[model samples]
Target: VIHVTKEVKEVATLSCGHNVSVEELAQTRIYWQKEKKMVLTMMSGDMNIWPEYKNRTIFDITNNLSIVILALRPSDEGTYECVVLKYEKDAFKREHLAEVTLSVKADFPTPSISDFEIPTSNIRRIICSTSGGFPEPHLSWLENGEELNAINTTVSQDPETELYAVSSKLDFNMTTNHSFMCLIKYGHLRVNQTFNWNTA
Candidate 1:
């Protein structure tokens, strides 16, 4: 199976195999399915796209038999299969041509850091938060450009939006001035915020 990774709202092109000839394509039916559910079918160059994919799909069966999906959503992430079929002897002979797996992601916005009041004069607590991202994001705390461990972090998904919300907390002693940073990593993107606390 071909594995494809795409960001939200991006376009995905799934290429079917090149084993069939144009003559065979003209005589056969090309069908697409997502997890066994019908997505579209093409016969003699005419397409019957399903309602959910009518406006979002483009296909060229005469050439590469590839399908392009536009404005990808999280719900669009799934396994897709392409089948080629020919009619013979009152029955259709089916041949599986291609299988593709799609993965969708969304980048999180820049992380924000805020501090809260503490009872001790030399102790402080800070929280970092970011939301509206896909999959799960990695969050960490930094002290003066150095990575810190043992931070408290949480991840949650919003059902309606299908996005992830992430937050982390850190506590430190404020005996001296310090530069604190919060960093979030999702896919190939990295976002961070820094706060400087000066005792003077």
Candidate 2:
């Protein structure tokens, strides 16, 4: 099982290699389906591609069964199924080989951290925000490298961009001095910023 996220106009490779030798691949047939619709099939030096996928699909017949889809769009985001039929006793036995999930995302910006002081309350309000990321981003507050539950985080999606935005706020009741950190994670990446209120 594999999960991948890509934006529009990016190239997405749906891997279906069976880790078999060339001799074994000759006796195997590969079929690709997206959301139950046939995309293509390769077997015995012959290739069959769907009409709509003829221009965007690429594969290897002699080496591997991997296929690459070009110009990814929101319409291409879905579950893809790869089926393999192996020659057994002069018959081809169907086998469900791989399942891949593809999603389209918008480019994300680095989270920005800012703060404000409560009017004469001696309390500090910290805010961390970021936008234009898909699959939702995670925001957290940390104190001494340990996660703290003293903050409120909110997530919302922009209908115009179809991307997720995250906002987090921390209310600090600073009596003498304090320090904390804020971090945001999107996809496989993470960013963090420090907030230190030093007072004597």
Candidate 3:
């Protein structure tokens, strides 16, 4: 099985063949299938593409048995099969070519922060969380519009949804009016949540 990972709107190429001669290619046929439907088929001397994937699928004899998927999305993450058929005797026999597991990542979501515990003069702690994001997000704390350090942080990913969830804890003490912030950033996207405090 081959592992092919790509981000959203990116191109993913699933290779099925190694270095083979033109003579060998003439005796073989390539078929690309996603889930349970056939995507593209190359047999005899021409290529046939499925109607739904006419523009998104690219395969030709010049590219060997590789299939390229364009404009990838999260919905495209699934198992893809590149099955090869070889002519033997009077029938076409199946040959194990390549099995690809595709993973598509998405952009991060808005970050949120809140005080989980009752605010006390002696101790103060806040939690920051961001949900349904791809890859991972960086978490940090800010105080009075400046960068602050967090006491603890954790990140986790869901196997089924392929989304990342991150949380962070900031422990600090305040005696006067203060502003606390939690920020999560990924690539060019940034989201932040703020908490205001007033003390006498």
Candidate 4:
């Protein structure tokens, strides 16, 4: 689940491919009719359905799923429903307020790190480093879910590269991660930049 802004300018989307929608349902097999009077279906990727909604409605597919973006207009303030096709001849329905007052606030402030890259080498007990932040960041390397706190765990601070970071190293034995999060925590802000890796 993610939190998003129903902002008028720019765009909105969900992350991890979670699609949430709101619609009216009188029976099973919920049908999503676009503002243009078109029905959207599950087989057709839902992302491909919102463009048809236009000024009447909007959606985000890379940020949040709990909120459906309705294109802002004076008359466009009310509750909406999410109708997911559950099974043959039977659909499940859910409701959410669509039409409502929107007090627009400041856009998402861009922090220091946009993205981070990982560098590694095999031949010389290589040192892998990653750093960049407003108030510094912390990092670590985990083969499983446990934190790497062994003696070989290289820990240091470089004036040339400091952002309050913590990182660890494990041999090439770990060529992939089922789950990994780059911890970037600045006071009240704690962001986990996680990803999955596959071995080739």
Best by lDDT: 1
lDDT of each: 0.80, 0.76, 0.75, 0.36
Best by TM-score: 1
Better of 3 and 4 by lDDT: 3
Estimate the lDDT of model 4: 0.36
Q: How do the candidates rank by TM-score, highest first?
A: 1, 3, 2, 4
Query: Per-residue lDDT tens digits of candidate 3, residues 1-200?
Result: 47878986689888876434578677777778898788887775567898978977677455557778787757678888888887886988976567888998786766766664445655677788887776578887887668887778889877555567899888666656778778888657777878887767
TM-score of 3: 0.54
lDDT of 1 by residue, 37-76 (tens): 9998887556788997887788765446778888777888
Model 2 over residues 67-178: C-alpha lDDT tens digits?
7878765567888888888777879987548889898765557777788887858788899888766656888888888988746788997654456788888887777687
RMSD of 2: 8.0
- For candidate 3, the lDDT comes to 0.75
Each candidate's root-mean-square deviation in Å?
5.9, 8.0, 9.4, 17.6
Candidate 1: minimum summed lDDT over ten consecutive residues — where?
18-27
lDDT of 2 at 102: 91
What is candidate 4's lDDT per residue for 1-200, written digit by digit as tens? Answer: 22334443323332223334343122223233423344233332434344545434433323323234443322222223334443333434333222222332222122222223336442112223343332444444444676654224334444432223344443443344344444434445555544445455
Write down the TM-score of every candidate: 0.60, 0.50, 0.54, 0.24
* TM-score winner between candidates 2 and 3: 3
**Pairing residues by index, what is the TM-score of model 4?**
0.24
